[PDB]
Structures are given as C-alpha cells and as structure tokens.
Amino acid sequence: MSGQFTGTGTGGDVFKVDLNEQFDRADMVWIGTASVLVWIMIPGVGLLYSGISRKKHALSLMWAALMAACVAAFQWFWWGYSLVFAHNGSVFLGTLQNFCLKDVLGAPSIVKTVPDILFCLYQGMFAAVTAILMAGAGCERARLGPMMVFLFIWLTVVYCPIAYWTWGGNGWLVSLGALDFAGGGPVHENSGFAALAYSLWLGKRHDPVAKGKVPKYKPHSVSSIVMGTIFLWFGWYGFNGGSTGNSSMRSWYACVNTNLAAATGGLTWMLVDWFRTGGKWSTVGLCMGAIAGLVGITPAAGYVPVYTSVIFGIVPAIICNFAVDLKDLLQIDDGMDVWALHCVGGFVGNFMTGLFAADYVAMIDGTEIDGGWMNHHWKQLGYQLAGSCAVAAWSFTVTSIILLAMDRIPFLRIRLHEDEEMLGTDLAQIGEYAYYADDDPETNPYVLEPIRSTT
C-alpha cells in the first residue's frame, strides 16, 4: 500500500496520491467534451434513418435511439468496456478484469493521455452509436424485447472483438500496422456488414419499394433526415476530434478535415444526383453525401493532409451513391441504407487512408506512423485491406449466426415471419389490442409491437 502511480488497477490510492497529476487537465477536458458530443450522435443516427426510410417502420428510430443508448450503456458497464480496454488482453480480445467497471479509475488508459474512467466514458459512446446503427439497420418489423437482447449479444461478440483488434492494448490489427483513426472499422464497416447480414437473412425480398420503376429517394420525413444530419455533423467533431486523446492541434486539424469531408461529400452526392436525374436537386442526396464524407474521413482524419480530405468527401459520395442502387438489383430495402453508407463508405475511407496517410500529420502531436503511399510506404494499403477483410468476415458471419440462432428460438425471434404476425388493422378490431388503431408514433404511448397471430 504505497499507493504511488502504478499504471495498473485504479492507478493508485486516492488518499495518498493525486491521480490527476498523471494527466494534462486540458487533454481531459477535451475528451470529456468530445464524449458529450458523441452522445448526441446516437439520436442523430435515429433521426437520419427514421427520416430516410421509404417504408413506414412501426418502431420509431428517434425513440429507439434512446433505447439503444440505454442498452449500450448497460452492456459497456457490465463487460463491454472490459472486453475492449482491459489492460491484460490477448491479441483477439480483452478479459473480464473490469467487469461492472471494477477498478476503472485513474490508471492511464490504452490511450495514455487520459485515465481509464474518462476513456471508458468516451469509448462507450462509440459502442452506443454502433448500437443504434444496428437497431436502425434491423428495425423493420422488429420485436422490441428480442431487439434489446440482440443488441446486448451483438455488442458483446461482434463489436467488442473488432474494437479490441482495432484499439485494444494488444490488438492484432494495431500490431500489423493498420491505421484507423476514429474507429471506422469497429463503428462503420462493422455496423455496415452486420446490416448486410440482416438484409440478406431477415430483410423482405422482392420488396415493393425496391422493385420495378420505383423512386430511389422517397423519404418518410425530410425534417428528420436534416435534424439527424445536424446532430451527426455536430457530434462528429467529438467523434473524430477526440480520437487523438489530447488537446493538441492534431485534434483541431482532424476537425478541419472532418468539416471539409462532410462538405465535399454533400455537394458531390447532390451533384451526382443532379447529373443522374437530369437536373433535379436531391434534398436526401445532400444529407447522405455529408454522412458519406463523415464516414469516409473517420479512419483518416488525424492522418491525412487537409487538402486530401476533399477526396474523402468526393470518392465515398460517388461510390456510395451508386451502391444505393444495388437495392434495386436485389429488390431488398431493409437494412441496405446502413450498409451503403457505413459499409461501403467505411471500406472506401479505410482503403484511402492507406494511400494518403502522412507521417508529418500524425507527428503534429508526436504520434509515430510509417505513413501511407504519401510516404511511399506501399505496404500500408495491404494492412488496410487486412483490416477491412477481418472486419467483414467477423461482422457478417457472426451477425448471421446470431440472427439465425434467435430466429429459431420462438421468443427470441427478432422479426416474425410474414405468415405468423397479425395485421395492425385486424389487431385494431380486437379489444385487448385496440391501440393498434393508432399507427402513428406521435400520440401512441405504446410501441406497435408485432403480435403472433396465435394469440
């Protein structure tokens, strides 16, 4: 019990040492602020995907964002933080050393400029953003109980390993040399490939909104799309700007890159839509392009020269705009918008990080990297591809397994089969289920949950 700084456990005895002395207070303030900013991205995701939908979802994703904030916070506390950021992990996962945040306090975190407790706060927001991306992707005819269980399991066995490989103290992707500045792999590529697994296993096939001569854009609520894009772009300054872990000017450089990629992505997607529609101005397109650029710059924001951030707007916006068209070749809508922006945007950004990463940008705050093709470090592109392939293999395969194992268990089935659920119009004709008469989630105090036509 000398209690001096150990770098392990709680970091020392608060009655004997001031744990705050190990950290620059301004670093801590910025990462605390950035945590608050990432938190508001959670309802941003909900608003965005609620608004863009071409189908009336029975579950309101604006409200489901709060449900996801609750489920993710509890999972992170319970063991999610420990599985990613315990200090004694393997190369593929952490441990249960910090179960229920036991001994999470003032030791320097995997990011040594902030203590464990603050790194826990910040990184837990990333877990929550990914949870609402997953709830958004799988929200069509979802049952709420099974969805909450799914999110808990999916965070534990899909998010946490991929996050560990990317960020953990011994993560194998970190060792390989792959670059991922703000977690494009664990957040965007991961949620995107998981969305794809949902689309192909549980999504509706031959979907009327994706079949024949149907509009590409047919939004539920433009004002929801816009409000979600506002919260997402506002919060993304914390998402990317805080991923330095410090108050250095690399944080602000990352913010300039973030803003410029969002801006160029928005204008690019709208310009592509203008060419492809023969002169129309796409309100949905401007918002999706801003998100495409934000996703695109996420792996790169603290590594690439400011002038290259425009390419992280332009190229993801172009490729994602055409990716959305694959919904019509497959005739599937469910889950595919999250796949198109986050999987395809995240893959493109991760790949381009291997091209444009620069050692002199990372060195703005002393961070040492070999760099990308900008430094003729040709091997970097293969490290990026190794990262993307690992994320895709794990996220798609394990998400498929979870969805299908729950589908075979009757009370955990996330989405009832079409032949077993009752119609809201016929439920409204029953007295013990009369509240389905109100099919508008603005005055209804109850979720219009799918009901098995066996009761």
Added chain:
Amino acid sequence: MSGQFTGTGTGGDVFKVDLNEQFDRADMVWIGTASVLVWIMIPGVGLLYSGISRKKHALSLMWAALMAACVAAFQWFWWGYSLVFAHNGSVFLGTLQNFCLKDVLGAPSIVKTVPDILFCLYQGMFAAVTAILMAGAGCERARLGPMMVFLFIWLTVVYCPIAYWTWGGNGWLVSLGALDFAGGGPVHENSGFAALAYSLWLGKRHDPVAKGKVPKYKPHSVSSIVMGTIFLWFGWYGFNGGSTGNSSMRSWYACVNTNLAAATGGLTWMLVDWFRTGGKWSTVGLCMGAIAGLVGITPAAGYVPVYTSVIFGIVPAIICNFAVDLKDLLQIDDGMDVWALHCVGGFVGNFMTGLFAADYVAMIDGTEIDGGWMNHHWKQLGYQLAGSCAVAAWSFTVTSIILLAMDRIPFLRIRLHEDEEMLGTDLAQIGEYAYYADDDPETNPYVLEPIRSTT
C-alpha cells in the same frame, strides 16, 4: 490599491494583477462548457413536459422555456446570484452585496477552483432549469404576465434560500453535513414540492384525464418527449459533470454515473410498465425512467461508486412509476408529473446518497467527506433526511403562500377560476379576440391567453 489577490470583491485590480493566475485554466474551460450544456436543459424541460401532457395546454412549454430562460437570467443578475453566492451571507441567506452583479469578477467563488463570474454563469443555469420546471408544473390555463411575475418572486424567495442552504458559503445544510452533489435539493426536490403545492391549490380537481378508467400515458407529442429527453440527457453531463467545479477525473466519474443511472432508469421504468400492462412497451415510460435516473443520481453522482449508480436508476424508476399512479387516487393531473419525477425522484436519490456515498470517491479530486453507510457513517442518512424535510417545508409552504396571495389579487391571479374565463370557441366569435380561432401554437403568433369574461 495594491490590487494583489484579496479573495474578496473583484479579486484584485486587473491593471495590476492577472486574476486568471488564481485558477487552473482547464478547470475554467470545463465549467464554461458545462454551463452551455446546462443551458440547453432549459428547452429540454419544456419539450419533455409539453410532450408528456395528457391535456392540450394553451401555452406551449417549448416556447415557455425561452420565456423562463429570459426571466431567470434577469432575476439572477438582479439579485438571485447575490442571495445564493454572496461571500458575506448568514446561515439561511446571502445578501445584496452583488446586486446587478456588482463586483462579480475574479475572486475565487464559494467553489474556489472557479472565479465568481464563471460560477455566476454556471449556477445561473440551475436557477433557469428550476424556473422552467416551475413554469411547466403551473402551465395549465396560466396567464403569461402573472406567470412571469410568479417566477421572479418564486426564484427570489423559494429557490434562492434553499440554494443558499445547500451551496452558500455559510449554508446551514452544508454545515450539518448533508450531501447534495449537483443540487437535487434546490432543483429537483424544490421544484417537485412546489409543483405539488400548485397541484393541490390551483390544479383542476376531478380532472377527466385522471378519473375513472383513463390511460396513464396519453401523450401530446411523443417526438417532443423524445427531443426533450435528448436535450436533458445531453445537458445533464454539464449539470452533474460540472458540479465538481474542476477538470479532475471526478468530473468524468460523475458523467459515467450519470449515463448509467439514466440508462438503468429508462430500462427499469419500461420493464415495470411491461409487467403492469401485461406485455406492452411504453414509449413514454422509457423517457420518464431515464429522467427518473438522472434526477436520482443528481445528489450522488460525484460521491457514489460506479456500480451503485445502477441503483439510482432502478429504485427511482420503480418508486416514481408508482408515484404517477397517485394522480388517479387524487384525480388531479395538473402539476403532478413534475412532482412525481422531481420531488419523488429527488427525495429517493437524496436518501440513497446517505447510504452509498463513499469517501474514496469524493477523494478522487481531494474532496473530503465522512461518507455514507458505505463507510458505516450511519448519521449521514439523518443529515440527508434533514435536508429533504427542510426543502419540503420551505418549498411547499412558501409556494402555497405565493400562489394564494397572487390568486387574491385580480391582475396577478395566475390561473383564472373556471367561472370567470371565456371559452376560446366563443372568443373566436368575437372580432377583437378572433385569433383564438387558431388553437394550435404552430401558426398562431399570439399566446392564447386566458381572458376574463368581464370584458
């Protein structure tokens, strides 16, 4: 006129000393940021209580939140800050030493890590949040002029004394040893018991929405409930996280506790509703439970171990969920939602702080406390109860007096009696009052103020 640091008055002469040298700049930045975050809780309250209402209020609480931000800011400047945070107070109140913020500048505040001027900014937001809680509680058939006068008086003679006892330099509750980390007494218990006084003296009796077989949840606007809950949870990181007064990791520890209590409160209330309705998922319940947990953890966030923060979600959510049922036993709706979340949630949290407060949590930033039952400091629970009883006696009794003294004065009567006001439908039939035809506050440029049927 040597102007060196005195700790009194302006703190020194700006032409001779740098007043900023007394403070850690990172402490100041966090409390400045947290002030901005608490500010957005003001419209959060308005949105939440506007949306949850089972009655169409003529006054829009989203808009009334801005009115309350204006009235509270002026009252705080005029003498509210001085009555709580003057440096020469008694044990029950401050003074008028800082009338119109005279000499409020660079002396270390009652919280010595920030200067008076910044502490004034931060604490004034708490006064404003309490003002909109009070306007929300008393908004049914309120007359706007009288309401603005009421809020000014109520802040001066109810909020400011209770805040002084809790936070002031010589406040008697501080001396007793009562713990109240982020102002659960002055903000939540206070507004809650004042709401109760409104309910029992001015609220409608035998209210059709609270009588017989009526729905417990019947919201005006679910999207308003959700947007309000978003702003409240986002801002609460400043409300609780800033209540350390510093940039230490106790601030971030308080944020982790805040997030986990909100999350567990939301899931608990929804689970209780699911059991009590026989299988329904309550969209209103999830939001009210998040607020219950946020209120519950407010007195405790910087004092309790992280694993106990889940109890500050669970137990307030359970007890508050049943408290809302008392609206049906009394057959009163007006004011009772604010009472149920803030009085009952604040009382439960204050009580549980005496159980779970821990000296090693407070000591994260050097703060010295005897602790709670966690440290077998058994007397702490009685100090907490002394605090709650003082708040309840003062807030309920003095709020009752104000409401009844204004009720007896004809131009200050806050709520016209049912027999003396004219119906909006009959006002619409008069030309000098034709604008009451529009009973929807979305296109109407005028408040649909109650009009005495004597003109």
Added chain:
Amino acid sequence: MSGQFTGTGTGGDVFKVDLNEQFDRADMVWIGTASVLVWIMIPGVGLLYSGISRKKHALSLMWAALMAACVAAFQWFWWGYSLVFAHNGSVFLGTLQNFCLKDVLGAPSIVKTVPDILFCLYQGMFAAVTAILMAGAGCERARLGPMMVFLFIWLTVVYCPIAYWTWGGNGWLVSLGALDFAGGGPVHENSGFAALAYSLWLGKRHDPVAKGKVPKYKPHSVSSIVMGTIFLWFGWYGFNGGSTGNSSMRSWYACVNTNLAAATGGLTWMLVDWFRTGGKWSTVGLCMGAIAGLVGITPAAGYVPVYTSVIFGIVPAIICNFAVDLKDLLQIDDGMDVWALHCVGGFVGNFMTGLFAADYVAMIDGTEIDGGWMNHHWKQLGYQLAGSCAVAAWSFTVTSIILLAMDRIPFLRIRLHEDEEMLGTDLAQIGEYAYYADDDPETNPYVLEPIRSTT
C-alpha cells in the same frame, strides 16, 4: 531547416519541435469547443428564418443551412481563410498564400493564443453563419444552382474583405481603433445590408403579405422559430465566448453578457408588442427580441460592464421592433427580416459599443483598449461609425452588383422574373415535372426548383 518556432509558415518542423508548446492547451480546448458551438448556429439560422416567414418558401431553409455549411466550408478552404487571415495582407485584403489551406498549421494566428489551424476552424464557422444568413435573406423563389454560386462569390468578394478590415493582421478598421468584439460588422451588419440589397433589387414589390391591413407576425412554423432560437442562443456562447481567443475569465464574462442581453432583448420585444397590440403576447416577438439582443451584444460582449449588457438587449429590441414596420411602408417582405435584425441590430450594437466599452473589462485578460465614453474616450464613437459606414457601403454596393450581374446572365439568374417561371400547379400537370404536385418539403425528395416556362 532548424525547424524552431518561426511564427510563420507551418510554425516549425513537427519532426524537430512540438508546435503545441507555443500555446496554452486550455485556450485551444475552449476555442475548439466554441467552434463546434458556432457550427450549430448554422442550422439555427435556417430554422429561425424558415419559421418566421409569412410566405411559403419553396426552398426549406432548415435544409438550405446544410447546403450553406457545405458551400462555405469549401470556399473557406479554397481561399476564404487566406483572404482574411493570411499573415502577409495589405490593409484591405489578405492574399492567396494559404490557398487550399497550404501551410496552415502551428504558427500563432492573428489571434496569437491559438494556432492557425484552430483559428481557421473557428473563423470558418463565422463565414458559414453569414452564408446561411445570406441564403435566408435571398431564399424566396431562389434557384439552387445560382444560389450556391452566389454564396461562393459573395463570401469571396463581400465577406472576406469586410472580415479582413475587421480582423485581419493589417486591417484598416483595427488600425483606426474601431471595436468589434465578436464580428458584428462582418457577420450581422454585413449580412443585413446585403439582405437589404436583395430586398430592393430582387424582392417582390407590392407584396400581398406587406400591403394594407396585414398581420405583422404570421409565422410558417412557431416550433421552427423556437428551435432555431434555441440553437442560436446555445451556439452564441461559442460565438461570443470564443472571441477572446483564450480560456481566461473574459470569455466567461462575455458569456454572462451574452445571456443577459438575449434575456433582456426577448422580454423587451415582447413587452413592446404587448403595448403596441393592446395586450397580446407575441410568441414571435420573444424570439426576435432574443436574437436582437444577441446581435446587439456581439460587438460589445468582451468590452462592456455586465450591468450595461441589459442596454444591448433593450435598445436593439426596441429599435428593431420598429424597423420591422418598414416592411409595410415599402410593401416588401423578401429579405427584410434578416435586414431588420442583423443590419439594424448590428448597427445599434456597434454604435453602443463606442459608448460603453471599458478598458477595465478588456484588461480582464490583458487586452489593451482606449475604451469608450465610459472612459471619456469620446473619439471612439466616430471610429465605430466609420466601421459601420464602410461595411454598409461595401456590402450593399457590391452585393447589388453581384445580384444584378447574375440577373443579366440567364443560367446564373438567382430569381427568375415572375413572367418567365412556371406555376407548380401547372408543372404538376406535366409528366416530366409531376413531382411539383407535392408542395410540402417534408416528404418530397426534390427541391421544388423554379422552372423557366420556356421548356
């Protein structure tokens, strides 16, 4: 290549020096946070002017705020930052030294407490707020392509010179001694006089909403007005609080002044409306008065004693409230709300800064000024008037030239003449333009762009 700190170029070689050593990290964190806060004012402007409109605009200003965020960010990167904040400017403009942010990194900025890259982030938000004020002012029957080109040109040749005179390293207004704390000239007076140029050249004359016995207030969406006012007041803490460039308590003093001016402006405008309507409570008026006070205090917030901030609420709210009446004398509505709040509010605030500026307020963080009439520095009022006259002459004249040169070019004409555009109801009857049937921007994926009746 010694790479030590030069104060020029990139500021030094990142491989040889730590550029962050030149700056207080807490200063950087506050200005980074304040940048994020100013960003959300961009959609705040859009919401406010969308909601207040007495006419149904075909272009949604909430959505157009994102378009403006994109166009302004790209212009700032391309050459806007360089034209204002290059380190080698003349007295009237900067240069293209920092084209595409070349060499923008760690040299101390024109504001020496933050590096170029962070000053670029922060000041670029001001450029974007001004862009959405301009898009709001000119939004009636705007064509989106021409508007985007107009904003790019207008930022380059109107905003950037005026910003340079106000803020640039050799700006002539700075040399004269004019005071403008947070950019009331470049943001508010500038956008306001440019709006006036739009009103008088492109606005509709003899407008039915401004002719005869018509309501002064007749809003499109009160909830939009309120949400915009919320985002604007929340973000204005960064707008004014960050304009110190540091973490000193002058930042927090500026925030107290900002809040009190907003509060007193809101209550004053509502009280004026109450007297002028004979007893009505104006929901629009409370919001416009808060904005009037925010605009009014912008040039003054870091220079005037706290008790005088109430005059920056009261007097702008009174004068602006009567200015709005000039819409009825001219019978023009288009562009005039932005003129009335930002030109008239900004002029009044700039003038009153010469009266109330105090050397002891500026000296809170070491800033040295002669002061205003408060210091019997009588000449200060003439320096303020010189500033306002220069802004008005440049903004009005050059904006007029741009609008008229584009008007004469057929594919750049911003607003089609009434005789050449087709009616949305007749477009809806054509198949290649059928989407004009939906005249509500909430479900329509396409901007209802004006179409020449020649195709």
